[PDB]
Write an enzyme that holds these catalytic residues in place. Structure first.
Site, PDB file in Angstrom:
ATOM      1  N   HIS B  43      55.235 -13.019  52.558  1.00 53.94           N
ATOM      2  CA  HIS B  43      53.826 -12.666  51.879  1.00 53.94           C
ATOM      3  C   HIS B  43      54.175 -11.419  50.902  1.00 53.94           C
ATOM      4  CE1 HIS B  43      52.803 -10.082  55.372  1.00 53.94           C
ATOM      5  NE2 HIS B  43      52.077  -9.508  54.233  1.00 53.94           N
ATOM      6  N   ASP B  99      57.020 -16.435  58.231  1.00 57.39           N
ATOM      7  CA  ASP B  99      56.735 -15.224  57.175  1.00 57.39           C
ATOM      8  C   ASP B  99      57.980 -14.537  56.983  1.00 57.39           C
ATOM      9  OD1 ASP B  99      55.488 -13.800  55.379  1.00 57.39           O
ATOM     10  OD2 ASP B  99      53.990 -12.902  56.704  1.00 57.39           O
ATOM     11  N   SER B 198      53.193  -4.420  56.123  1.00 58.95           N
ATOM     12  CA  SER B 198      53.575  -5.731  55.642  1.00 58.95           C
ATOM     13  C   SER B 198      55.176  -5.741  55.483  1.00 58.95           C
ATOM     14  CB  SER B 198      52.939  -6.201  54.566  1.00 58.95           C
ATOM     15  OG  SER B 198      51.537  -6.829  54.774  1.00 58.95           O
TER      16      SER B 198
HETATM   17  C1  LIG Z   1      46.259 -16.241  56.642  1.00 59.62           C
HETATM   18  C2  LIG Z   1      46.464 -15.011  57.673  1.00 59.62           C
HETATM   19  C3  LIG Z   1      47.098 -15.695  59.105  1.00 59.62           C
HETATM   20  C4  LIG Z   1      45.555 -14.165  57.840  1.00 59.62           C
HETATM   21  C5  LIG Z   1      45.125 -12.806  56.666  1.00 59.62           C
HETATM   22  C6  LIG Z   1      46.457 -11.845  56.431  1.00 59.62           C
HETATM   23  O1  LIG Z   1      46.653 -11.010  57.411  1.00 59.62           O
HETATM   24  N1  LIG Z   1      47.315 -11.785  55.338  1.00 59.62           N
HETATM   25  C7  LIG Z   1      47.092 -12.896  54.472  1.00 59.62           C
HETATM   26  C8  LIG Z   1      48.018 -12.757  53.510  1.00 59.62           C
HETATM   27  C9  LIG Z   1      48.952 -11.663  54.129  1.00 59.62           C
HETATM   28  C10 LIG Z   1      48.338 -11.128  55.299  1.00 59.62           C
HETATM   29  C11 LIG Z   1      48.329  -9.619  55.715  1.00 59.62           C
HETATM   30  O2  LIG Z   1      47.097  -9.296  55.060  1.00 59.62           O
HETATM   31  N2  LIG Z   1      48.799  -8.908  56.000  1.00 59.62           N
HETATM   32  C12 LIG Z   1      48.501  -7.379  56.080  1.00 59.62           C
HETATM   33  C13 LIG Z   1      48.452  -7.093  57.634  1.00 59.62           C
HETATM   34  C14 LIG Z   1      47.286  -6.946  58.123  1.00 59.62           C
HETATM   35  C15 LIG Z   1      47.049  -6.636  59.304  1.00 59.62           C
HETATM   36  C16 LIG Z   1      48.044  -6.338  60.152  1.00 59.62           C
HETATM   37  C17 LIG Z   1      47.733  -5.697  61.503  1.00 59.62           C
HETATM   38  N3  LIG Z   1      48.644  -5.796  62.519  1.00 59.62           N
HETATM   39  N4  LIG Z   1      46.621  -5.394  61.857  1.00 59.62           N
HETATM   40  C18 LIG Z   1      49.202  -6.236  59.588  1.00 59.62           C
HETATM   41  C19 LIG Z   1      49.655  -6.769  58.486  1.00 59.62           C
END
Ligand SMILES: CC(C)CCC(=O)N1CCC[C@H]1C(=O)NCc1ccc(C(=N)N)cc1
Ligand code: NA
Ligand code: NA
EC number: 3.4.21.5
Lengths: 28, 251, 10
Positions: B43, B99, B198
């Protein structure tokens, strides 16, 4: 690689970082 | 990283920053797995709902870093991408299943005190370490809260959570290619990954051979460090077949 | 907010 996972400034010098022991203690 | 601490120098020498060429900014975390291969989340590179689709030439990899913003002369190394490989069954439409992405560098990076690859797990390490309650470590330069960026690399240790608790914490369909980690509300301690973390690594130190292994990739989460919610990680061992194929047939 | 990187990396 042969040497993966061994950090030059820690494992390679037998130095521990400040919280790695927290991980070890959880591996029961 | 929420509720983490500043990293020590050289504590995560496999940590990679995915950096945008223009405008110059952090895009994601990543990890060094050999002198020419970098592992990240798919992603970070492809996510059509957000109109995200990066190509090799949009990006640089910065390795050996500590400071988020500073150009760390004589210490970091900056590398160009030769090619990006995304898992062919990466499910961006539903739940980010599989992912994972590989990036091949244009030239090998020189290892150093601050640059060194992490191991990838074999089956027996994965079986021994991926157990509820066992802690791993996540690192990144992402947000310190869901609303706030760190001066340097942050670190947080978090326990793997049992699969039923992971599932019951969300309405998203969880797969075998993911695991979750974090403390429960009852447990007291807290911490989590967040936006900008990420693609960064979830690592564990094997007590069998004292090497660090990357067991997960920061993938998704609902908010950050919310009580009763957990961060989700790509399960690296489960996707090892594909990793190996790519490196075997493209390296 | 990012220090500019050396021009040669593009
Ligand atoms: C479709 C998906 C299952 C939920 C949305 C989501 O989290 N997204 C949609 C696109 C990429 C990812 C993201 O934002 N990743 C960033 C992220 C957010 C939260 C955390 C955490 N551990 N709290 C880690 C990475
Ligand atoms: Na559920
Ligand atoms: Na939580």
């Amino acid at each position: 690689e042969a040497d993966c996972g061994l950090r030059p400034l820690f494992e390679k010098k037998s130095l521990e970082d400040k919280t790695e022991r927290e991980l070890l203690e959880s591996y029961i | 990283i929420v509720e983490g601490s500043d990293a020590e120098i050289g504590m995560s020498p496999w940590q990679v920053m995915l950096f945008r060429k223009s405008p110059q900014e952090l895009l994601c975390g990543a990890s060094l797995i050999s002198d020419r291969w970098v592992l990240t989340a798919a992603h970070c590179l492809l996510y059509p709902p957000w109109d995200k689709n990066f190509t090799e030439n949009d990006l640089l990899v910065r390795i050996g870093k500590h400071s988020r913003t500073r150009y760390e002369r004589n210490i970091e190394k900056i590398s160009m991408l030769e090619k990006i490989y995304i898992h062919p069954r990466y499910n961006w439409r539903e739940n980010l299943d599989r992912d994972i992405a590989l990036m091949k560098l244009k030239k090998p990076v020189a290892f150093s005190d601050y640059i060194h690859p992490v191991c990838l797990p074999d089956r027996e390490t994965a079986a021994s370490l991926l157990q509820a309650g066992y802690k791993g470590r996540v690192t990144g330069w992402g947000n310190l809260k869901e609303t706030g960026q760190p001066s340097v690399l942050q670190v947080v240790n978090l326990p793997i959570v049992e699969r039923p608790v992971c599932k019951d914490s969300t309405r998203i369909r969880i797969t075998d290619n993911m695991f979750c980690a974090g403390y429960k509300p009852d447990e007291g301690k807290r911490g989590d990954a967040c936006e900008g973390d990420s693609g960064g690594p979830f690592v564990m130190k094997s007590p069998f051979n004292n090497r660090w292994y990357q067991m997960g990739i920061v993938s998704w989460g609902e908010g950050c460090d919310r009580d009763g919610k957990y961060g989700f990680y790509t399960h690296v061992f489960r996707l090892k077949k594909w990793i190996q194929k790519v490196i075997d047939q493209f390296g | 907010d990012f220090e500019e990187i050396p021009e040669e990396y593009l």
